[PDB]
Amino acid sequence: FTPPTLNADTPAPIFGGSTGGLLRKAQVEEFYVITWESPKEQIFEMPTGGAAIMRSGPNLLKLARKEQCLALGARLRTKFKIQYQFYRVFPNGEVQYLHPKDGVYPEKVNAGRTAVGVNNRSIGQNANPAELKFAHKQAYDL
C-alpha cells in the first residue's frame, strides 16, 4: 500500500478560533494533521472544543494529540460516511503517515500486517516475578 502524500494546499474548515488548539508541543515536538474528503458543507464538533463548518471538498485539520485524531475520526465515521486518514508532523518538516497503515482500518483484518506483541500462552501461564529477578525481560514480554 502506497501511503498518501500530504498535499499542503487543501484548505481548513471554517472555524472561529479555539484556545484548545496547538500549544508549544506543536512547535518543538509534534503535531497531527488529519485529512479527509467531504461530500458537502457540514458542521462538526471540534475535538479541541467548539464547532466548525467543514468544507465541501477535502479538509485539513491540525491537531495536537493522536487521541484527538481518533476522537474526530470515529465521530466522522459513525455520524458521517467519511473515510479519513491522519499524519504525524514533526518540526523539522517530516510528515509521518499513521493511520490506516495498510489503507484499510485496523478493525478489519488484512493479510499484509503481521502479529507483534502476541503471546502464544495465556495470562495464567505467565511466569512468576520471583524467578525473573534482575533481568531486562519481565513476566509478559517473553
Binding site: 487521541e67 481518533l70 493511520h99 478489519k108 500486517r113 503481521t114
Partner: peptide, 12 residues
Amino acid sequence: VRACPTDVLEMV
C-alpha cells in the same frame, strides 16, 4: 480495536 482511542491495536 474499536475501543482504542490512539490506534494501537490492529487485527492480524
